[PDB]
Design a protein around this ligand. Structure first.
Ligand code: HEM
Ligand code: HEM
Ligand code: HEM
Ligand SMILES: O=C1NC(=O)c2cc(O)ccc21
Ligand SMILES: O=C1NC(=O)c2cc(O)ccc21
Ligand SMILES: O=C1NC(=O)c2cc(O)ccc21
Ligand SMILES: [K+]
Ligand SMILES: [K+]
Ligand SMILES: [K+]
Lengths: 156, 156, 156, 156, 156, 156
């Protein structure tokens, strides 16, 4: 086993967070489409795809390090009941997920696994972009009002 | 005469429903255009055209089965006085139409007219898509407010 | 109500005639297709489409004049049992329909609704073109014989 | 062995019907070409090709289900002596074929082989289209006369 | 609530099977890539994508029927230790999946949800195509030998 | 009857051999596809098509000679159970078939039917090309081994 055991555990934890996000964002996307909020549905679909790509890269790295990728354990999805709750739930997931990424990067640095660190840092940048998007949407609801915000997300 | 008599009666019942829908949706479309709600006008125009295409297929099938297509009997149009009533009236019509489609499909299955069943199932899929659209629009009125909903349908 | 009440009644009468023609010509088209007389089927399809376009223009004018377009009342279709009867029935409809158009134009002129008159005159020109076609087809049956006439309308 | 034994027997029965049709239509096609009725020759060629495609799909399905496709048993060809007899013979064959298709579909439904049912329903739609063509041609002989009907099928 | 409760339960059962397959096939794909068997890796990737598309359609249908799609419950993945075990595990999963699909289709038919039945039949056709592929690969291992079979799947 | 009676009998015998070959090669093709030996499946499909083209030419010649083409009598297909047996069965058919072609050519020469002789000689050349292919494949099995030979025919 070339990989550090705790690096592989961290990568499996990040992978687990990505698997939650894939499903949460995909369901939220299709809920927004069901409600006719097609601009939100499309954006959230692309967020789900992005997490799928991150999961792929993590799986590939874990296998290279001779670990066993964990696609069996799926943690808790938090599905919102309206647009505000869904955006907030995605934000909660990302805030928790970025904390785990930082902890994983610390450990990779400590054991000199600089390539795993670089992979995690690229994922972290994408997740901070998603936090930027989510916080901005919640702010727009405050600034333009919920009804206007939803109206602006009806059409793609 | 090759067609089962009750199959032909069912197909003419579905055809009669299509003829109601053609006219109700065409009038609703032109009412929305008169009011300057051009996006609703255009969508409802396309709903009317889709029902015209279904009527065509039913007429063709009835003639193949050596029945007499009934284009004479036009049942009650459900014409709303405002956008919410018009959408609800279209939805009520579609719920009646899908009930009749299911009863026709049962009978086609029982007498082994599988090609008529397949035609009716294709129509049913299209009518359920219309129900999806209509329920979604009524939900959007609740989520964004009536005035915003109408505003979003002014421009094509 | 900007529209003259009797103008709107005349426009609804013309619209009623167009609704009969749409369905009569559409059924005749599909009967000719069922019989393999594809050239007649295609021509009659385009006659039906033309009447659909006239109906649309009438509906739009009635709504502009603040009348209620009548798409509920469908008058008597006269469906022929063979090619000669079908052509004759279409001709009967057009002869009756053009009489109603002339009466409507007289009234529009009387009350100075020159734009409604112009719309009706454009429809009248199209209907006289259809009479030209129909009389010519019936004459061809006399000149070339029924069997040859039908033969000449097998292929598109 | 995954296939239901009686499903495979039904599929081989349908395959046997297709093999009859392939040969009957191919010979009728080449008879019409020999007689200079090239449009009938070409249409009947394409009917034979369509049956070849159906046979291919049946063979593929039987092999997937771990049955033995029967390409050995060739039932009685119904070869006409003139155009009217050839068309009537094709029609008689197709009426027998659709009876067998309906019985096969019933059995597939009963044992939950829904993919075989869907294949057979697609074949049935194609055979009913052929019945439509054949009944139409026999009707045209009556409407335009035999000599005109043949004349109309000299040139492609 | 428009959906039949047991239909929704069946659709969520099928969805749960798709979620297992997505992850099992994605991991098998990346295991094959890790081992340098790039053609197997690519084929299995595309199998995983196809299951993703099926899951999407199921989620959309469940939401239309006013049910709650279950993306939370992930059943047992069947992960093989070598190529033969991985293919057999995929085959075992697919045989379970088609059993559940047939039971769902029976129920949809019984309650006249013909559009859900049509969706499930399309999924079933795709899963039987996968069974065809898998049985064929296991047969090829026997016919060409394991080492040759793997060699043939090194290069894309 | 312009054709020599025994020429027509010979042409019907060759046609009979072609009808066996069409079905034998088509089934063998689809068996190879079922087994994932796609290169063999495709080659054998094209052999079947080639025999279909020969059959067409024979049918056309027989009709020109005022004979009755025999598409009713189908002789014995010999379907192999594995690749070696299938190749050997195709070779057996071709060896028998070419003997019949030579006998037919002798007779055509004797009665001065040089155009039928030329047609048969063109078919004979194609059949000798097929013998060349078949003998070569059986030789390759001997030279590279069965498992390698099959491996080389997995991919198109
Ligand atoms: C008031 C009654 C109807 C109106 C106002 C109407 C109006 C129209 C209009 C405006 C079009 C588009 C023509 C164009 O610009 O190309 C159209 C197309 C068509 N209509 Fe109708 N229609 C009516 C009834 C029917 C009926 C009863 C049928 C069949 C039974 C039918 C079948 C069609 C078909 C097949 C098309 C062509 C659609 C396509 O493939 O593009 N319509 N109709
Ligand atoms: C006397 C018997 C048959 C004759 C004379 C015949 C003749 C032909 C001919 C002339 C073609 C067109 C080839 C070309 O120019 O491209 C053709 C195509 C074909 N035949 Fe046959 N055929 C026969 C039996 C069969 C059978 C039994 C099958 C399957 C069981 C079959 C399957 C096909 C297929 C799949 C094609 C290709 C069609 C396409 O996709 O373009 N045929 N046949
Ligand atoms: C570990 C779990 C999953 C992984 C690793 C994964 C991975 C991927 C990857 C790599 C792609 C291709 C993206 C691209 O390059 O364009 C993709 C596409 C897709 N995935 Fe997933 N996915 C997962 C779960 C899901 C789930 C649960 C769904 C739906 C419920 C889903 C639906 C899709 C869809 C719709 C596409 C787009 C396919 C297309 O139309 O091109 N995936 N996935
Ligand atoms: O998610 C997984 N990674 C593995 O290596 C594995 C093995 C297994 O038997 C079940 C699930 C999993
Ligand atoms: O054809 C119609 N034009 C209308 O304005 C209308 C209203 C109504 O309740 C039913 C039918 C119709
Ligand atoms: O294969 C055939 N050629 C023919 O002329 C013919 C006639 C018939 O009644 C049945 C079969 C066949
Ligand atoms: K607004
Ligand atoms: K003539
Ligand atoms: K090798």
């Amino acid at each position: 086993m070339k990989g550090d055991k705790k690096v592989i555990q961290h990568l499996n934890k990040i992978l687990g967070n990505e698997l939650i996000a894939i499903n949460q964002y995909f369901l939220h996307s299709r809920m927004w489409n069901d409600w006719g909020l097609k601009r939100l549905g499309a954006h959230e679909y692309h967020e789900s795809i992005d997490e799928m790509k991150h999961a792929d890269k993590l799986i590939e790295r874990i296998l290279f390090l001779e670990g066993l990728p964990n696609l069996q354990d799926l943690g808790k999805l938090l599905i919102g009941e309206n647009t505000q709750e869904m955006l907030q739930s995605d934000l909660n997931l990302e805030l928790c997920a970025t904390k785990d990424l930082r902890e994983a990067i610390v450990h990779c640095e400590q054991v000199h696994d600089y390539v795993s660190r670089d992979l995690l840092k690229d994922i972290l940048e994408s997740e901070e972009e998603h936090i930027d998007y989510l916080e901005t949407q919640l702010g727009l609801i405050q600034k333009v009002g919920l009804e206007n915000y939803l109206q602006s997300h009806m059409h793609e």
